[PDB]
Amino acid sequence: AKLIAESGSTKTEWSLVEGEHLIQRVFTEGLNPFFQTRREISRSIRLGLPDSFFKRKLEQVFFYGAGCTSAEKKSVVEASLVAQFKTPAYVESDLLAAARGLFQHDSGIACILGTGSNSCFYDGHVIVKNVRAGGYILGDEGSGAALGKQFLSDVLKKLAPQVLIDDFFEKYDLTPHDVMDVVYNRPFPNRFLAEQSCFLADYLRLDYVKGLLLSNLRSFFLRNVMQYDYLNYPIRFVGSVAYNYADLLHQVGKEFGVELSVVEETPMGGLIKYHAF
Amino acid sequence: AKLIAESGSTKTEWSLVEGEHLIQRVFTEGLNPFFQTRREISRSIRLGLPDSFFKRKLEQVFFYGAGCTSAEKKSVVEASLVAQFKTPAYVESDLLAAARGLFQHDSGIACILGTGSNSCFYDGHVIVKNVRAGGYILGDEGSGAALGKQFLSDVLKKLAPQVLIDDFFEKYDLTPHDVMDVVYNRPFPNRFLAEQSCFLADYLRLDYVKGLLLSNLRSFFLRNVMQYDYLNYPIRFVGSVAYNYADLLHQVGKEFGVELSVVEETPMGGLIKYHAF
Ligand SMILES: CC(=O)N[C@@H]1[C@@H](O[C@H](C)C(=O)O)[C@H](O)[C@@H](CO)O[C@H]1O
Ligand SMILES: CC(=O)N[C@@H]1[C@@H](O[C@H](C)C(=O)O)[C@H](O)[C@@H](CO)O[C@H]1O
């Protein structure tokens, strides 16, 4: 048996598979070594997963997570996985999951639009070019975190519509002071900012929300997608933001003169197909 | 004798005064209750200040600091001051220091452009309207933290001039991965981002830098200043970024049709004048 895990910072998708047949699917909280220590990751995995995962004999454990950028960061997750599963674990970027999941052994451009945002050029085996994500502060354009950051900024400065302001404070039972506390004082701020993508998904009628989405989606293209040879290679998307705003993403694509066809919610479906050889 | 202190997240200016005569002035590190606990601030004051401040008997303590949003946050700083000085302390926002320091008892609009950015309408007694700063993440347009946040974003995205990228990494001896840790893992990220404002001041000849300054300075006016009756009231700036980029700030001022003639480095000179009667 093999285990494939895909994390994006908000949720971690676990797939216990046999060849190509899925045995069990479980979701835990997101795993990111920029926001979690080795102890916190180990706790998350053990609390999140049933005992059935830690009982079944595993040959390899394939992990793809956000934050797994450097060797030091990949060591944190790996040592945590090895501790729990007693199995050689291969920790890679969630961007490689997006690449393998969307293309298998084909060439093109794989992108992520979820909690964070990332992009790469895939030749069919390895990532040739990769514009750095930068995290929720120094990047992640067109991501849920970027949407929420822009939204909450407008909420605090009363530049968003009143209906949105009132509905936000009612739904989350917060005050401006509390919003300040969650972002700066409470952990996983990137989750809370990204969580606002789900909130604003119901207000697609408002001009503000359309303007918020488009401007962020365009910002992703201009800074990430534009850097690649995008006019000659297929561009495929993965992520919650991509999936929920598939119409607006396709619109932005057409603005930059590209035809976005494949928009998957999770790259996991293709990862099982990929890890079947 | 009484003590006037002014903090802006990066540094704290201390003025020991009798009436309007300065006895001693010392700088320490910045005090922000969003980034520091009560025990951290107490240690910063105790070790930071000379033995001259503690042996001298004080009448009142006037403290204005960033992060002193609610009464809850002010109490943190207040408890620290009383524990050190053993004299009633008055903890307010640094925005009120800007208002009292620039206008005294006159009506107008006081603005801060330092590590963070803040704005208000001062009627000569109290702050009437206050557009929330939002902090370095959810606001602070045209601030030092905004400049650095945008610059380092471009650095990682390989969208900034190569001359700036190379000089940045050479100055700090950092790699892309290292910069990621300084912002996300290592404390006082807002300080490091704002410090990049000092860096970009050398390269004011580059079109990129001029374009980056003007972009942020306008964003401050658009989102903060223009919420007030700005065409019928004097606007006066204070802060390190305001002082350093006084030429470009005055440029933005004339573009919006206001005469920015008062730009100060610190509002301390006015606070010494204020606290006399
Ligand atoms: C440090 C951090 O959080 N970055 C992550 C990315 O992680 C990879 C490993 C990277 O750093 O390149 C991730 O691909 C995207 C999409 O989820 O979101 C970003 O926020
Ligand atoms: C939470 C925080 O850091 N905010 C501060 C402001 O603090 C006041 C108290 C406020 O938030 O109203 C400060 O005036 C400006 C300018 O220095 O910078 C912001 O970043």
Residue numbers in the entry:
A (entry chain A), B (entry chain C): 1 to 277
The publication says:
The production of MurNAc-bound crystals of MurK and K1058 was very challenging but eventually yielded crystals of MurK and K1058 in complex MurNAc (termed MurK/MurNAc and K1058/MurNAc, respectively). When comparing all residues of the sugar-binding site, differences can be found in two locations. Firstly, residue I69 of MurK is replaced by a less bulky and more polar threonine (T69) in K1058. Secondly, in the region involved in lactyl ether recognition, residues S133 and P134 are substituted by an arginine and an alanine, respectively. All other residues in the MurNAc-binding site are identical and occupy conformations very close to MurK. Although we do not observe such an interaction, probably because the side chain conformation would have to be in an “bent back” setup, a partial charge compensation is possible, which might compensate for the loss in affinity by the loss of water-mediated hydrogen bonding to S133 in MurK. Indeed, the affinity for K1058 is higher than MurK, with an apparent KM value of 28 ± 10 μM, but the catalytic turnover is severely reduced and suggests that MurNAc might not be the natural substrate of K1058.
Unlike other bacteria, the pathogenic Tannerella forsythia, a member of the red complex group of bacteria associated with the late stages of periodontitis, lacks biosynthetic pathways for MurNAc production and therefore obtains MurNAc from the environment. Sugar kinases play a crucial role in the MurNAc recycling process, activating the sugar molecules by phosphorylation. Structural and sequence data showed that MurK and K1058 both belong to the group of ribonuclease H-like kinases and are members of the ASKHA (acetate and sugar kinase/hsc70/actin) superfamily.
